[PDB]
Design a protein around this ligand. Structure first.
Ligand SMILES: *[C@@H]1O[C@H](CO)[C@@H](O)[C@H](O)[C@H]1NC(C)=O
Ligand SMILES: *[C@@H]1O[C@H](CO)[C@@H](O)[C@H](O)[C@H]1NC(C)=O
Ligand SMILES: *[C@@H]1O[C@H](CO)[C@@H](O)[C@H](O)[C@H]1NC(C)=O
Ligand SMILES: *[C@@H]1O[C@H](CO)[C@@H](O)[C@H](O)[C@H]1NC(C)=O
Ligand SMILES: *[C@@H]1O[C@H](CO)[C@@H](O)[C@H](O)[C@H]1NC(C)=O
Ligand SMILES: *[C@@H]1O[C@H](CO)[C@@H](O)[C@H](O)[C@H]1NC(C)=O
Ligand SMILES: *[C@@H]1O[C@H](CO)[C@@H](O)[C@H](O)[C@H]1NC(C)=O
Lengths: 930, 48
């Protein structure tokens, strides 16, 4: 019988209290939705890595368990009895988790008065036992599941209770949740992991020679050569079994059976005891200078054993001579047989040298050999060259002295088979990135998966599996390709986007609606109306000013680390200097954006401006902050601090307060409302607002009367647009994404810096006191230096990224200052610099870390077709319009301004004469009234 | 110039490249590869 484990089996991984957080734990868990064995009410079940044991009964039928390949637990009303050591202490679902880790036996449990719910198991007992549990059996409907190494994302409420968990490896959505460290996923595409084709078989290819090497002749020879004339023997074409046989250089003896050698030579002699220390690289002495000198870069093994009952003589042996005088010290592996005696009375040394650097293998250890598997991802081993990949028949042309082929990275990419002598390419097994496309968990749990840079024929590391489509970006699984084209929702790549239609669809993105302009050589479209448009532009100006405490981040009130940290010195001095430069740059950015005017202009008491209503951008006196309603909305629209501060990371306040920035903004607004563009170029010259509007209409080539004749309509359009600004900002949550992105970048950088303190950087632990109170001080300094270099590197990376982000923010602030000068303090002719349309004016509003420009532009509307001519022929003279264009109803001919239909009688006062009617192409006969 | 090549790096494959022992050792160096992946993803998005 089998059942679903649902989301049961979660226990508390430690004794730590965590409050209202999400924590990631690697531990032995019961995988979600596992297949759990079911029993009704006693087989002997295995104990693989720990056990989840649940039961649903109302009669206490189950009583205990016996653990062993011994340990016994019985739950009796008197006490629960544990016996191996001894210990004594103490329908409804009862769940237990049994683990045997690090010599300790741990039991977690819970009781609930399988169900489709979540309930964590609190720890029950920990016992020092020490036995090797391999099987277990219950003692008396119970369910059994098995633990596996897994990463879980557990959520702790404010009470420290685990209320939910995510099994990261269960499915793509869970992997995305674990990647984002949240239970909620916004719509988008997320790089989650890498897929890698896993090897199927392990192949071994060693030479077929099965003869054993003549080691015994070297070692068991009755007499050994004298050290001055040491013997050298070549080992070739044999199996070297080192178990028959010890200081090894460049290799470990316990691994010597697993490697292939090429130039192996045994050098044998007999020496006098202590000079054993002189058979070594670099060593000096009589033997190491005049008899036997090893290379500085010597790899191989020196094996020496005392031969007392082999060579000792009661009279003094004279068979072993040595060179006691010489001109100059020998070169490595150089012999001189051109001399004293030891006179041994009541040590044989052999030096094995070999080359492990590629080359054909002449001597190989005993490893057996298997078949040669091709076209499949396998773990291969060619003469000691281990690896994983696909082996294919080659078109390369090797040479007899060549055994391996190498690529740019000095990586072996082609190999000659030791037996068949064929050449094989080695490619790595197929792999790539994996992206998850989600419409958002608030919408659906449905996902699509993109395997990047890989076609669908080879689509494993993610261990989950998942409406198959091929794109230049890779293989898309879980999305249906539709022939319709929509605006891009989730970008996939190469023109392919994804969207949530009930289902996930992939499509070719559209660039917009096709449009054809009715072009002809004599037709012109002229607007007859206009719309006053007010658009919003949001610009970051400054970032958070950050300061870092050197020792508090690196050491954290540890004195040995603090004393060790002064061996670098200039590092964090320059780090603090860079951060201080960034902070003063932030204050400079704010100053250059908002302090353009030196007078603080006040808005007049009476707030009549010819029908224009500025109440939503002017300061609101009732509110204590004196902010405008739109500024109020902006500032509402955008314990961790203390925790970061306790690690040396603090935030400095900006020099200008939000109130002072609001004062600057209100001064700019009052200046522009009461004096137009004059206060930017000199003394503020007052002018009625309708007259300033007429000036700005003249700026964009529209005559003044157009605004005076449409004053009420223009004011109403402006008021309506300003009122819609509030709704557009408030309804849209993504409106202020730039400033929030600045805030989130700062927060993410700080969080990364904080979480790098748990990084060990390859040391025993990430805690200094553990290293200092559990290790020799000579090695404690080494490991603490490892940690210190890691943390200093983290700080330097943080500062470098802060400098790059500060440069980007400085560019943004320079652009904002330019827009303040050119869009707020004047009227700009630069296309699209101050909003879409013909710029009229702009109003600044302060925002938490930036500025918001409200651009008021003139957009032509209600265009009409007319027939046009370059010139009008009259009295043999060509007339060209002075400040307009010639248009026609169809019968009569007028002249009009270009951006607003205002037909006028063609007179000699709105045209000018140039030449006859013989050169201009398209000239039209008509009357020019005088 | 308007954009540059969008690059992605498989941190483990570059550093270790089929060596599982190297991967286990590399898992002890923290979120280095996570930071690099985030930075490169930001660059790639900025190109588009
Ligand atoms: C993937 O394999 C299919 C089938 O052989 C092939 O048509 C396709 O071109 C391959 N992908 C690429 C990128 O070449
Ligand atoms: C002017 O446009 C018309 C229609 O678009 C075309 O037939 C005519 O050839 C054009 N004029 C000249 C000189 O080509
Ligand atoms: C211009 O458009 C406005 C709406 O913005 C409308 O009330 C007005 O009647 C229009 N005028 C003309 C001449 O079409
Ligand atoms: C200006 O607009 C606000 C908001 O729409 C409104 O409450 C106020 O009465 C208006 N003032 C005038 C003078 O129309
Ligand atoms: C101008 O004429 C073209 C072709 O006759 C037509 O497609 C277009 O809609 C006209 N424009 C207006 C504003 O009516
Ligand atoms: C031509 O313009 C005059 C305006 O003075 C008037 O007859 C009419 O608006 C136009 N004719 C036609 C057919 O539209
Ligand atoms: C315009 O007038 C001139 C001379 O008066 C004549 O030659 C020409 O043909 C006229 N244009 C048209 C389109 O009739």
């Amino acid at each position: 019988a089998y059942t679903n484990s649902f989301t049961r089996g979660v226990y508390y991984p430690d004794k730590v209290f965590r409050s209202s957080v999400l924590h990631s734990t690697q531990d032995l868990f019961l995988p979600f939705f596992s297949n759990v064995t079911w029993f009704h009410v006693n087989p002997v079940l295995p104990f693989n890595d720990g056990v989840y044991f649940a039961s649903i009964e109302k009669s206490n039928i189950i009583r205990g368990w016996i653990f062993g390949t011994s340990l016994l637990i019985v739950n009796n009303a008197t006490n629960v009895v544990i016996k191996v050591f001894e210990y004594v202490s103490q329908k409804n679902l009862r769940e237990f988790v049994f683990k045997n880790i690090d010599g300790y036996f741990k039991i977690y449990s819970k009781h609930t008065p399988l169900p489709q719910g979540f309930s964590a198991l609190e720890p029950l007992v920990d016992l020092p036992i020490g036995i090797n549990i391999t099987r277990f059996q219950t003692l008396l409907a119970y369910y059994v599941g098995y633990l596996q190494p897994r990463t879980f994302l557990l959520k702790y409420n404010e009470n420290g209770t685990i209320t939910d968990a995510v099994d990261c490896a269960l499915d793509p959505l869970s992997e995305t949740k674990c990647t984002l460290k949240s239970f909620t996923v916004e719509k988008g595409i997320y790089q989650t992991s890498n897929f890698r084709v896993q090897p199927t078989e392990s192949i071994v290819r060693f030479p077929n020679i099965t003869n054993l090497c003549p080691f015994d002749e070297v070692f068991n020879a009755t007499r050994f050569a004298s050290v001055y004339a040491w013997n050298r023997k070549r080992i070739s074409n044999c199996v070297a079994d080192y178990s028959v046989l010890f200081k090894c250089y460049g290799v470990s003896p316990t691994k010597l059976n697993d490697l292939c050698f090429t130039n192996v030579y045994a050098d044998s002699f007999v020496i006098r005891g202590d000079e054993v220390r002189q058979i070594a690289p670099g060593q000096t002495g009589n033997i190491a200078d005049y008899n036997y000198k090893l290379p500085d870069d010597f790899t191989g093994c020196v094996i020496a054993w005392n031969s007392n009952k082999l060579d000792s003589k009661v009279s003094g042996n004279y068979n072993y001579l040595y060179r006691l005088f010489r001109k100059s010290n020998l070169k490595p592996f150089e012999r001189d047989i051109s001399l004293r005696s030891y006179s041994f009375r009541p040590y044989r040394v052999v030096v094995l040298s070999f080359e492990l650097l590629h080359a054909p293998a002449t001597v190989c250890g005993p490893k057996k050999s298997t078949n040669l598997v091709k076209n499949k991802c396998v773990n291969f081993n060619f003469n000691g060259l281990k690896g994983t990949g696909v082996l294919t028949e080659s078109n390369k042309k090797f040479l007899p002295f060549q055994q391996f082929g190498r690529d740019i990275a000095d990586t072996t990419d082609a190999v000659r088979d030791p037996q068949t002598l064929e050449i094989l390419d080695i490619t790595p097994c197929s792999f790539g990135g994996v992206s998850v496309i989600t419409p958002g968990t608030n919408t659906s749990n449905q996902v699509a998966v993109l395997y990047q840079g890989v076609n669908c024929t080879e689509v494993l590391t993610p261990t989950w599996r998942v409406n198959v489509f091929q794109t230049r970006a890779g293989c898309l699984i879980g999305a249906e390709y539709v022939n319709n084209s929509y605006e891009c929702d989730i970008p996939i790549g190469a023109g392919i986007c994804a969207s949530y239609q009930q289902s996930i669809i992939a499509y070719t993105m559209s660039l917009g609606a096709e449009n054809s302009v009715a072009y002809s050589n004599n037709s012109i479209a002229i607007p007859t109306n206009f719309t006053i448009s007010v658009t919003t532009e949001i610009l970051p100006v400054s970032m958070t000013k950050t300061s870092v405490d050197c020792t508090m981040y690196i050491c954290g009130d540890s004195t040995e680390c603090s004393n060790l940290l002064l061996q670098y010195g200039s590092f964090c001095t320059q780090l603090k200097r860079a951060l201080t430069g960034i902070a003063v740059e932030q204050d400079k950015n704010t100053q250059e954006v908002f302090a353009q005017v030196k007078q603080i202009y006040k808005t007049p008491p009476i707030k009549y401006f010819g029908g224009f209503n500025f109440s939503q951008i002017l300061p609101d006196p009732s509110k204590p902050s004196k902010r405008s309603p739109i500024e109020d909305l902006l500032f509402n629209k955008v314990d961790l601090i203390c925790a970061q501060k306790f690690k040396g990371l603090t935030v400095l306040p900006p020099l200008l307060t939000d109130e002072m920035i609001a004062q600057y903004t209100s001064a700019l607004l009052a200046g522009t409302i009461t004096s137009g563009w004059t206060f930017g170029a000199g003394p503020a010259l007052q002018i009625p607002f309708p007259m300033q509007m007429a000036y700005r209409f003249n700026g964009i080539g529209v005559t003044q009367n157009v605004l005076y004749e449409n004053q009420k309509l223009i004011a109403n359009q402006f008021n309506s647009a300003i009122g819609k600004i509030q709704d557009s900002l408030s309804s849209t949550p993504s409106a202020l994404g730039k400033l929030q992105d600045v805030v989130n970048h700062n927060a993410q950088a700080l969080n990364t810096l904080v979480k790098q303190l748990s990084s060990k950087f390859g040391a025993i632990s990430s805690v200094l006191n553990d290293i200092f109170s559990r290790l020799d001080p000579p090695e404690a300094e080494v490991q603490i230096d490892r940690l210190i270099t890691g943390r200093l590197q983290s700080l330097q990376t943080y500062v470098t990224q802060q400098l790059i982000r500060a440069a980007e923010i400085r560019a943004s602030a320079n652009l904002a200052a330019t827009k303040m000068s050119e869009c707020v303090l004047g009227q700009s002719k630069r296309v699209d610099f101050c909003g879409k349309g013909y710029h009229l004016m702009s109003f600044p509003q302060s925002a938490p870390h930036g500025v918001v420009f409200l651009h008021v532009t003139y957009v032509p509307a209600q265009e009409k077709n007319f027939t046009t001519a370059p010139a009008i022929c009259h009295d043999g003279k060509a007339h060209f319009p002075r400040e307009g264009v010639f248009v026609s109803n169809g019968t009569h001919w007028f002249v009009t301004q270009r951006n607003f239909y205002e037909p006028q009688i063609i007179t000699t006062d709105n045209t000018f004469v140039s030449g006859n009617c013989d050169v201009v192409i398209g000239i039209v006969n008509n009357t020019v009234y005088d």
